[PDB]
Amino acid sequence: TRDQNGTWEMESNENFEGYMKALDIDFATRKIAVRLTQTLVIDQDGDNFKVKSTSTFYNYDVDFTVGVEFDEYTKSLDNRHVKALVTWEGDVLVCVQKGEKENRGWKKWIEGDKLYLELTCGDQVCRQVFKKK
Ligand SMILES: *C/C=C(\C)c1ccc(-c2ccc(N(C)C)cc2)s1
């Protein structure tokens, strides 16, 4: 399946530290962030996505259209400008963020009753598994 709608609660988080470090997020933010359960709210209508992740102390909001390039100012994260593009490979959703960092982006897919998120930056791979609320 390609359907990723829902409110998703984090079950496991393998190597989040490794990924955040590759982005140059400040240590103080990293230490707090690795302990926190995330609630991911995905609103997917055709090719239009509105994604909100929230925790006790941090917000992450982004709106995008699949197959349409867009200029991003990553305000709350690392404060950079990137040219972003999101597409499909079989049943895997693939984002490439073109800019300074290499291999920057992510992949999301389903196997059984879980959502896999693979976040990449450089030579690091973070694997997160979520289950539906
Ligand atoms: C496709 C889903 C993506 C890219 C994300 C979901 C949560 C994200 C996130 C949460 C929190 C932080 N910090 C720095 C607290 C960064 C990213 S990205």
DSSP 38-86: -EEEEEEETTEEEEEEE-SS-EEEEEEETT--EEEE-TTTT--EEEEEE
CA–CA distances in Å: residue 4 to residues 44, 117, 122, 124: 7, 11, 26, 24
- Technique employed here was X-ray
For residue 59, give its domain range: 6-132
Tokens (6 digits) for 111: 């196997």
The number of distinct structural domains making up the chain is 1
15: DSSP letter: S
Q: Whose CA is nearest to atom 9 of ligand 1?
A: 60
| 3-state SS, one letter per residue, for 109-133 | EEECCEEEEEEEECCEEEEEEEEEC
For 29, left (φ over 0), alpha (ψ -120 to 50), or beta?
Answer: alpha
What type of residue sits at position 101?
A: K
Number of other residues whose CB lies within 10 A of the CB of residue 72: 15
Kindly provide the resolution of this structure in angstroms, with one decimal. Answer: 1.3
Residue 71 lies in a domain: yes
CATH code for position 121: 2.40.128.20
Sheet of 114-121, strand order: 59-65, 48-54, 39-45, 6-14, 124-132, 114-121, 105-111, 92-98, 81-89, 70-73
Which of 126, 129, 81, 130 minimizes the C-alpha distance to 101?
Answer: 81
CA-proximal residue: ligand 1, atom 5 (nearest): 53
- Ligand 1 nearest-atom number relative to CA 58: 15
In a domain, 1, yes or no: no
* Whole-number Å distance between alpha carbons of 106 and 109: 10
The answer to whether residue 18 is domain-embedded is yes
Helix (H, G, I), strand (E, B) or coil at 10: strand
Is 126 inside a domain boundary?
A: yes
Query: Sign of dihedral through CA atoms 130, 15, 1, 106?
Result: positive
CB contact at 8 A, 117 and 107: yes
Q: Which of 50, 53, 66, 85 has most ligand 1 atoms within 8 Å of its beta carbon, as the pocket-test mutant?
A: 53
Longest CA–CA span in the chain (Å) reads 38
Compute φ and ψ for 91, nearest 5 degrees.
Answer: -100, 20
What are the CB-based long-range contacts (under 8 Å, 24+) for 128-132? 128/10, 128/12, 128/13, 128/14, 128/16, 129/10, 129/11, 129/12, 130/8, 130/9, 130/10, 130/11, 130/40, 131/8, 131/9, 131/11, 132/6, 132/7, 132/8, 132/9
